[PDB]
Each structure stands twice: as structure tokens, then as C-alpha cells.
Amino acid sequence: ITNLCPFGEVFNATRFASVYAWNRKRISNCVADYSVLYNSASFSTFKCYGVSPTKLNDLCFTNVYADSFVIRGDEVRQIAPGQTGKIADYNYKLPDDFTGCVIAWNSNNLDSKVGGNYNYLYRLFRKSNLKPFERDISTEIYQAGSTPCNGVEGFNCYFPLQSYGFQPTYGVGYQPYRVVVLSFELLHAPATVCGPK
């Protein structure tokens, strides 16, 4: 048994991304021990949709995509197939036929700051909902009034990204939650990601 997948570089990362610019890591050409995640006591939310959790060590997929971001506590329920919200529509959309596992844990001791941590943003305004697994990092001004809003911010021209204020004294549901979405997708290329033998 050799060359374990670098889940430590994804779950234990120092700096996570915001949900409008969520990071994607292509876990491939390695062997993955998923049961060191399922038996970890740290994860508050662990929901696997297309696949049973204990069967992950036996099924082989050709690659896994790990999408990492930081959201609010009350917004965790929107990271699911078929849910609707600000995050589901304009930040991160899961497909209805989603196979994979959504893992989320409270990171109030890391991403919160006493003066507020404004490094985490989320898209508030968009003309239409995102397609599943679509990335939108455009920071252009939002034309809300259809006046000749020629780029300049002002009345009826909103900045599309709102900042999550994160403070350690916030209640549960306003505290930051780190979310990693593992999407095991199986193209008919030869499979390279398996469990331990």
C-alpha cells in the first residue's frame, strides 16, 4: 500500500476559498482511505447521496473532485441536491443526480476574527441561477435598473459580492463552516482511485 491521496492538503488546508470562487482539486492517480474521514470526530455534517458511506473503500472511481469553500452555519443545508438558496442559485449548485459526499465542519476557531473577518465573500446578485458545477468569479457591476449604468457603481448598480462578517462571538448559524464536496465521477477511462486492499 503506497501513495495515499492527499486529503490532508485539502481538509487541513491553512487558507480556504470563498464560495463564489470555490477551490477544486482533482484527486486522481492515488488510493484513498475514506474511512479515516468517516471515523473522524471533527466533521459535524457528513452526507453521502449517491453512495453508501461505508462502501467508499470498495468502489473504484476514475477521479474525485474536491470542492472546498467556507459558508455560514445556516447555509449548510443548501449544499445538497435540489435545494435552493443564495448559495445554491448564485454560488455553488449541485446537480440533481449528484453522487458524492458533502462534508462540513465548524471552523469558528480559524476563520473568525475579533474585528470581523471580511476575507470571505458570496455572490448576492446574478441574472440567472448557476448550472451545476459552474464557477463564476466575475466581479462586474450588477445592472439592476437597466439605466445606462456604464460600469460605475452607485444607485441601482450594486457590487455583486457581499462579505460574510465572521466574529467569534457570533451565534451558531452565523459562525463559519468549512465545506468540502467530494464528487466521485466515473468516466470510462481506466480507474485510478480505489480504497485500500
Epitope: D74, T84, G85, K86, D89, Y90, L124, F125, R126, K127, S128, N129, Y142, Q143, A144, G145, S146, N156, Y158, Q162, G165, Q167, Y170, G171, G173, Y174
Partner: antibody, heavy 117, light 108 residues
């Protein structure tokens, strides 16, 4: 510059249907968050429904399954269809532009819906 | 759900005084609070949002403070046209709930 003009309020029998319309000027309702907020006579404001910029619709618990918020994009108009109206729905309704269902900077004039036999 | 309580239920102060309206949430709603001013027979007007930031076109005598559960709306100098009902409205929780309202009266 921003105006919200309502119509469709009136007397309706219990169990009836009523279609409130909010025309808008100064902004497009197809790309803005819109809310219907009702106020009982002599009581406080109560949020009824919201439609997002992308088209996602949400309703309060007392009105879920009965009301339907929608909009018709080519004429800058917001609609609220109401079906099976009960006695406690007699209220003044306001259409309000929101900053991402957070706060309502611009409000409609308000129309009264009376539900009685 | 968040039960949003305003105190006092009515307030009568002579003009030129400072009026402090207190609003209290059942949970901690951070700085996700807005204040509205409703004249009789007139739609509500947004005064402040994010519990501190004034709406444009609102005069400088209105201000806000507070965080979490307790919030205050301060009118530094009451004048004649401030006879209205003031609502505090949270938007941190998923259902948007308004307060009970405070009627402000002027002692002439």
C-alpha cells in the same frame, strides 16, 4: 424616480382568489429581489413572500401552499396570486424592492385586501 | 423562529429631546437589522440598515447601534414630523420577521 404602483385589491369571499399587480418604474423586476409584505389593520408588518433575481420564490409558513409570487419580465410587473383566502388575510399589501431579501429600501403604496362574506 | 420585541410600546417626548428606541431579538442576529419609519397612511421608509448604516436621504439625526440581541435606534433631536411608528426588522434568520412597532408622540 423609483415608483411602485399597485392594483387588484378589493373585497373577496373566503376561499376566493385575487391577483395583486405591482407595476414598477425606475428599475426592472426581472433582475431585482421583490417582496410582498402585508400589514394587518391595527397590527404590525408581516413578510409574506419573496422572489429572487434568479427566479427562486419563498413564502411564509402561514401562506405556503396558498399564495404564488411571480413576475412577467417583458412589462416590468410583479404579481401575487392568492387562492383559498381565509379570514386573517385581510391586510394591506406592499410590494417592496429588496437588497437581496435583506432590507426594503423602496416600497409600494399598498393596496387593501378584504376577505369577508 | 426569532421573536422580535420592541420597547417601549409607546414613547411621548417633547421636541428637541433625544429618543432611544430599544429592540431585542430572541436569538443573536449579529448586525443583520434594519429600521423602518411608517407614517400614518403612508408606506414604511427605510431609515438604517446593517444596524449602523444610514440610508441616503435620511437626515443625520437618526443613528443606530447594537449587535447580537440588543439594538438601539437613536433620534438625537425630535422634531414635529417624526410622529410615526418605528419597526426593527431582522434579516439574519431565514424568515424575515418585523418587530411589534413603537409609536412615537410629541409633547407640545
Amino acid at each position: 424616480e423609483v415608483q411602485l404602483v399597485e392594483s387588484g385589491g378589493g373585497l373577496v369571499q373566503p376561499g376566493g382568489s385575487l391577483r395583486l399587480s405591482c407595476a414598477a418604474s425606475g428599475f426592472t423586476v426581472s433582475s431585482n429581489y421583490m417582496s410582498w409584505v402585508r400589514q394587518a389593520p391595527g397590527k404590525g408588518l408581516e413578510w409574506v413572500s419573496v422572489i429572487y433575481s434568479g427566479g427562486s420564490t419563498y413564502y411564509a409558513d402561514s401562506v405556503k401552499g396558498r399564495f404564488t409570487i411571480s413576475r412577467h419580465n417583458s412589462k416590468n410587473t410583479l404579481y401575487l396570486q392568492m387562492n383559498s383566502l381565509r379570514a386573517e388575510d385581510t391586510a394591506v399589501y406592499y410590494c417592496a424592492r429588496g437588497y437581496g431579501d435583506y432590507y426594503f429600501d423602496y416600497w409600494g403604496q399598498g393596496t387593501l385586501v378584504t376577505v369577508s362574506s | 423562529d426569532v421573536v422580535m420585541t420592541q420597547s417601549p410600546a409607546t414613547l411621548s417626548l417633547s421636541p428637541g429631546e433625544k429618543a432611544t428606541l430599544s429592540c431585542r431579538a430572541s436569538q443573536s442576529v449579529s448586525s443583520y437589522l434594519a429600521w423602518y419609519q411608517q407614517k400614518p397612511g403612508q408606506p414604511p421608509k427605510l431609515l438604517i440598515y446593517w444596524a449602523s448604516t444610514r440610508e441616503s436621504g435620511v437626515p443625520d439625526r437618526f443613528s443606530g447601534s447594537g449587535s447580537g440581541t440588543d439594538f438601539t435606534l437613536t433620534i438625537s433631536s425630535l422634531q414635529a414630523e417624526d410622529v410615526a411608528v418605528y419597526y426593527c426588522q431582522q434579516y439574519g434568520s431565514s424568515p424575515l420577521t418585523f418587530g411589534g412597532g413603537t409609536k412615537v408622540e410629541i409633547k407640545r
